[PDB]
Design a protein around this ligand. Structure first.
Ligand SMILES: CC/C=C/C/C=C/C/C=C/CCCCCCCC(=O)OC[C@@H](O)COP(=O)(O)OCC[N+](C)(C)C
Ligand SMILES: CCCCCCCCCCCCO[C@@H]1O[C@H](CO)[C@@H](O[C@H]2O[C@H](CO)[C@@H](O)[C@H](O)[C@H]2O)[C@H](O)[C@H]1O
Ligand SMILES: CCCCCCCCCCCCO[C@@H]1O[C@H](CO)[C@@H](O[C@H]2O[C@H](CO)[C@@H](O)[C@H](O)[C@H]2O)[C@H](O)[C@H]1O
Ligand SMILES: CCCCCCCCCCCCO[C@@H]1O[C@H](CO)[C@@H](O[C@H]2O[C@H](CO)[C@@H](O)[C@H](O)[C@H]2O)[C@H](O)[C@H]1O
Ligand SMILES: CCCCCCCCCCCCO[C@@H]1O[C@H](CO)[C@@H](O[C@H]2O[C@H](CO)[C@@H](O)[C@H](O)[C@H]2O)[C@H](O)[C@H]1O
Ligand SMILES: CCCCCCCCCCCCO[C@@H]1O[C@H](CO)[C@@H](O[C@H]2O[C@H](CO)[C@@H](O)[C@H](O)[C@H]2O)[C@H](O)[C@H]1O
Ligand SMILES: CCCCCCCCCCCCO[C@@H]1O[C@H](CO)[C@@H](O[C@H]2O[C@H](CO)[C@@H](O)[C@H](O)[C@H]2O)[C@H](O)[C@H]1O
Ligand SMILES: CCCCCCCCCCCCO[C@@H]1O[C@H](CO)[C@@H](O[C@H]2O[C@H](CO)[C@@H](O)[C@H](O)[C@H]2O)[C@H](O)[C@H]1O
Ligand SMILES: CCCCCCCCCCCCO[C@@H]1O[C@H](CO)[C@@H](O[C@H]2O[C@H](CO)[C@@H](O)[C@H](O)[C@H]2O)[C@H](O)[C@H]1O
Ligand code: NA
Lengths: 201, 203, 460
């Protein structure tokens, strides 16, 4: 086949300019297409042959000779904030590489720990909830039941429309029989030069 | 205008055979190839393509798992999926331009390869107790097999997380950052009639 | 006070580039647009059609405007050549140049192709008028026309050789499509086409300044002031003639069969015969065969009768064109059939000019009052030939688009491989059959009556 690599899965743009790069495992002869895909929508054609638009606003331009192709959006608005894929049509086995844009904001994480309720404790289970509602970047969550644990489920939304901050839900499922290990702590590590620890006993 | 329309979501059980249709309007189907694409909330794969007047090509990964047919009397391309287990994804159908090799128009169908259908359980998680500015509550919905829509009574500060797979069921969390706490309730709704609403108390 | 041999040679050298490009373009522009410019075949079809139709439209209008051009100290034709060559040698190089434009390659190619054909017309048609202005002697003008023709043919050979050995040698990548599924690059090919365009432009400038140096005007002042200006009425009167219209339609249909053949033949040789690097050699074999066959067909026309010559000449390529779409792409068979095709091209182009003086004598016998008898014939022939060849090339490339042509494909789909075999063996065969039937309907019966008309030419 042929591999198409998009190095940056997430990119930061602030209504100025964005340059998305696609790399190829073989010289494709400038046979590269670029697709726009909003979440919940099918991929839509933007550029074929790496230099030709197909009924798109003029801010979406594309260049690239061989083995390194680029798509530039010099007018990036809220419609431009979506995912973009790069396809090569040099070989029989077609390929993609995905990439997404993100806005530019500040920083500052928040955390909150919540014990399982009595209704859940009655029905043979205990789910401890760790909420990280507003932060920017990437974050890591560790569970400490006086010892590290790696049996929790983690979920992350997209980006907030207004606050422009990411969130994270960590659910730690522990049975009632194993519900005596001491205390439960949720620790969040971000780019803040120190972890945020919230604990219950 | 060229447009392809696909069938609705399907929920096969384990290793059942699922057929996805793709009807095509606005162009002769026999002149252009039809390509199928694979997206499991990630980058795109290419399963196969079918020419409506002859040969059908498959990628080596999907050889024996996918079967492509084309009915030119109704211009409908059918993709048949056999064994499953990790194929719960979005299968897109799009016609290739017969000149270059790219895809101008796209469709999209959903496939969920799971088993079971149960009612969700709602737990109104609250704060164990502290004092620092505004308060943050929570609501946990665990143990279902559909797409819910968690809501709050007229409050727009909520964050509803994407559901995650646990066992063979789905779990979802919701967070609300409220300043004052006179009274709050969490309302959710299940794909089926299943739907209830539980208030959030203290401690 | 006659024309020098060096002056006539400079005149012919200056006239060569005209058809040269008209050949280089007619042989390689379809391949350049489909495979190097990376256009849709629909846009390539509309570019070819609109460009050739604009050339056909601009030829008589430029002729009429130059007929209204006054006399200068530089001449009546030399200012047109000297102010048409520098724009043309830029427009030609801007044809063979892939633009870095985000949208609208079609507009770029249409504008620069139509501008180049307009400026080539403004070069050529005053040069075509120049043969009556170089000298007042009929024998000197005939010798200059013979030198022009001989150089024109050698220039077609030279231009085909240059383009084939510049852009047919550089290897290029392909695009393996799904049907194919079981070191140079595209920029190198674009650079090769730009190099060929620059070389042909340099030859154009050199021959233009040679034509300026070696040819004067001698203050002819359009000879006798009396001349006919009834273009449409004269064309209708000429087409009302029996043998004249018969030769017009026969020559036309034959030139349509051998002008639809070339543009589809480049694609046919490169995609149906396995000759990705060898179609240039096939084209040079065809041109060399035509150059060899021209004295042979002169001897055949002088030996075995005029009518039988055009019977055996234009219909000789029919079994070979049937054979090439019926063999598994044999190298030697294609080479020998290309030799026979060059022989038939030489016959199809040489023989109507051989048959023309008999028709002219018959028209002079039937119509004693005649002014510009050929001047309307070659014209009408050029206009209809160019328009029909444009329409033919456009319809053929649009048929390739409807068949599903794959841009830079390594293996074409079956519809395209059928369409390229049809377009080199069915439509040229049909048009050659039509031309043969019209030549059967040609009533002068070669010289058997024409010499008797020559006896009437002795009467007048
Ligand atoms: C299987 C092989 C496939 C093969 C392709 C066939 C190919 C040949 C491609 C050819 C180039 C097209 C040639 C069209 C130009 C024809 C004119 C020509 O090349 O003919 C030479 C000479 O005979 C004419 O003299 P000209 O008409 O130029 O001057 C007359 C002036 N005047 C009226 C004032 C007396
Ligand atoms: C100036 C002269 C111009 C002459 C141009 C003449 C070209 C006309 C041919 C059109 C090209 C397509 O030729 C085509 O070949 C295939 C043969 O398998 C057949 O095609 C048939 O099957 C294919 C599927 O594979 C489909 O396109 C369609 O169902 C049907 O057309 C038809 O016979 C013909 O549509
Ligand atoms: C001698 C030529 C005769 C032409 C006379 C008929 C002209 C009108 C026929 C139109 C039929 C379809 O025409 C077609 O329409 C679509 C929609 O805009 C255009 O757009 C098409 O090409 C682009 C790029 O390849 C792709 O997005 C896709 O293939 C399609 O959208 C094409 O450029 C045009 O070829
Ligand atoms: C001399 C013969 C003329 C024959 C004309 C036959 C059609 C030739 C190709 C026309 C389509 C391609 O050329 C195209 O034209 C128009 C302007 O002219 C523009 O077309 C574009 O306009 C705006 C962008 O501002 C877009 O909203 C529109 O969707 C797009 O079609 C493009 O800039 C150019 O790419
Ligand atoms: C680049 C420079 C080219 C070399 C110099 C220019 C060419 C020099 C002459 C070429 C050699 C002979 O050229 C060839 O001679 C024969 C003579 O029978 C001519 O043949 C014709 O001559 C005259 C008309 O011109 C008639 O008697 C008759 O129609 C026929 O015999 C050809 O029209 C001519 O092409
Ligand atoms: C008109 C004057 C002479 C002009 C010719 C000048 C020399 C041309 C030679 C170079 C042409 C391009 O390079 C060419 O590439 C193709 C590759 O398929 C090959 O082409 C050759 O393959 C074999 C080699 O015996 C033969 O069938 C045949 O001679 C030719 O088809 C040769 O490797 C090379 O001749
Ligand atoms: C029998 C008639 C003979 C006529 C043929 C001979 C006349 C023309 C001379 C041959 C020139 C061949 O042209 C050859 O093309 C390749 C392109 O891949 C060039 O290669 C290079 O060209 C330019 C140089 O700046 C670069 O932009 C390009 O990247 C590089 O590939 C060679 O430098 C050139 O030598
Ligand atoms: C080697 C034989 C020489 C024969 C005589 C020369 C004929 C003309 C050959 C010139 C080839 C030019 O080759 C080309 O040049 C320039 C940079 O160098 C680049 O071209 C690029 O720059 C120009 C700058 O105006 C822009 O139009 C555009 O951004 C792009 O086309 C290409 O990368 C290269 O393909
Ligand atoms: C050296 C190898 C390359 C050879 C290339 C071809 C060489 C030239 C071939 C000469 C063929 C001449 O073919 C024919 O000759 C006669 C003159 O004799 C001319 O025919 C006409 O010329 C003049 C001017 O119109 C008039 O006298 C009259 O109308 C008629 O005789 C044309 O030229 C052509 O109709
Ligand atoms: Na000519």
């Amino acid at each position: 086949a042929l591999d198409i690599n998009s190095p940056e899965a997430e990119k930061n743009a602030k209504g100025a300019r964005a340059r998305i790069t696609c790399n190829a495992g073989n010289q494709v002869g400038s046979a590269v297409a670029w697709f726009n895909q909003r979440p919940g929508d099918p991929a839509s054609l933007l550029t074929y042959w790496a230099a030709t638009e197909k009924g798109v606003a003029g801010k979406q331009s594309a260049q690239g000779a061989s083995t390194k192709f680029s798509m530039s959006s010099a007018g990036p608005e809220a419609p431009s904030l979506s995912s973009y894929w790069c396809l090569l049509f040099e070989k029989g086995a077609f390929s993609f590489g995905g990439s997404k844009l993100n806005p530019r904001e500040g920083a500052g994480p928040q955390a909150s720990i919540l014990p399982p309720s009595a209704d859940l404790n009655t029905s043979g289970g205990a789910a401890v909830v760790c909420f990280l509602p507003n932060w920017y970047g990437n974050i890591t969550v560790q569970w400490k039941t006086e010892a590290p644990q790696s049996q929790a489920n983690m979920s992350w939304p997209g980006q907030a429309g207004a606050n422009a901050a990411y969130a994270m839900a960590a659910v730690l499922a522990i049975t009632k029989g194993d519900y005596g290990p001491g205390s439960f702590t949720c620790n969040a590590s971000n780019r803040g030069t120190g972890p945020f620890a919230m604990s219950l006993n | 205008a060229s447009k392809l329309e696909l069938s609705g979501p399907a929920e096969p059980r384990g290793s059942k055979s699922a057929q996805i249709t793709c009807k095509a309007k606005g162009f002769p189907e026999a002149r252009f190839w039809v390509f199928w694409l694979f997206q499991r909330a990630a980058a795109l794969d290419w399963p196969a393509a079918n020419f409506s007047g002859g040969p059908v090509q498959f990628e080596s990964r999907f050889q024996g798992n996918a079967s492509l047919k084309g009915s030119q009397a109704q211009a409908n391309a059918e993709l048949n999926i056999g064994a499953l287990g990790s194929s719960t994804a979005t299968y897109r159908c799009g016609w290739k331009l017969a000149n270059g090799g790219f895809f101008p128009s796209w469709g999209g169908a959903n496939v969920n390869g799971a088993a079971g259908a149960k009612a969700p359980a709602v737990y109104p998680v609250e704060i164990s107790g502290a004092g620092t500015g505004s308060v943050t509550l929570g609501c946990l919905v665990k143990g279902y097999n559909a797409k819910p829509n968690l809501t709050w009574p007229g409050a727009s500060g909520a964050l509803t997380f994407p559901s995650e797979l646990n066992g063979a069921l789905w779990n979802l969390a919701s967070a609300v950052t409220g300043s004052g706490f006179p009274s709050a309730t969490c309302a959710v709704g299940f794909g089926a009639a299943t739907d209830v609403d539980k208030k959030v108390a203290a401690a | 006070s006659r024309l020098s041999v060096c002056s006539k040679l400079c005149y012919a050298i200056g006239g060569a580039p005209y058809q040269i490009t008209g050949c280089a373009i007619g042989f390689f522009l379809q391949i350049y647009l489909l495979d190097v410019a990376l256009l849709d075949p629909f846009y390539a079809s509309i570019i070819l059609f609109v460009g050739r139709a604009w050339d056909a439209v601009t030829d008589p209008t430029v002729g009429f405007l130059v007929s209204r051009t006054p006399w200068t100290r530089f001449g009546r034709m030399m200012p047109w050549i000297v102010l048409s060559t520098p724009f043309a040698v830029l427009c030609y190089f801007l044809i063979w140049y892939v633009p870095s434009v985000d949208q609208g390659k079609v507009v770029w190619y249409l504008i620069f192709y139509c501008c180049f054909q307009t400026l080539q017309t403004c070069f050529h048609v005053p040069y075509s008028a120049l043969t009556m202005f170089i000298s007042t002697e009929q024998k000197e003008r005939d010798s200059a026309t013979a030198y022009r023709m001989t150089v024109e043919v050698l220039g077609t050979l030279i231009g085909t050789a240059i383009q084939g050995q510049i852009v047919g040698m550089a290897n290029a990548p392909c695009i393996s499509t799904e049907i194919d599924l079981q070191h140079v690059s595209l920029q190198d090919l674009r650079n090769a086409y730009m190099i060929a365009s620059g070389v042909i432009c340099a030859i154009y400038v050199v021959c233009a300044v040679v034509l300026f140096l070696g040819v004067k005007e001698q203050k002819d002042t359009c000879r006798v002031r009396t001349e006919p200006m009834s273009f449409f009425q004269g064309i209708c009167m000429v087409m009302g003639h029996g043998p004249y219209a018969k030769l017009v339609m026969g020559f036309l249909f034959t030139s349509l069969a051998f002008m639809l053949l070339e543009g589809n033949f480049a694609l046919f040789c490169i995609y149906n015969l396995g000759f990705r690097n060898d179609f240039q050699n096939v084209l040079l074999v065809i041109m060399l065969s035509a150059t060899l066959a021209i004295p042979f067909w002169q001897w055949f026309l002088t030996k075995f009768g005029k009518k039988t010559a055009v019977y055996i000449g234009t219909t000789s390529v029919v079994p070979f064109l049937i054979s090439v779409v019926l063999v598994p792409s044999s190298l030697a068979v294609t080479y020998i059939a290309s030799f026979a095709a060059g022989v038939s091209v030489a016959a199809a182009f040489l023989l109507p000019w051989s048959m023309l003086p008999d028709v002219v004598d018959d028209f002079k016998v039937q119509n004693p009052e005649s002014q510009g008898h050929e001047a309307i014939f070659y014209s009408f022939y050029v206009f209809f030939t160019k328009f029909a060849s444009g329409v033919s090339l456009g319809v053929s490339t649009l048929s390739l688009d409807f068949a599903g042509y794959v841009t830079r494909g390594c293996t074409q789909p079956g519809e395209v491989k059928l369409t390229l075999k049809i377009l080199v063996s069915a439509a040229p065969i049909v048009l050659i059959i039509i031309g043969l039937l019209i030549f059967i309907s040609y009533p002068i019966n070669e010289e058997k009556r024409q010499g008797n008309r020559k006896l009437l030419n002795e009467q007048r």
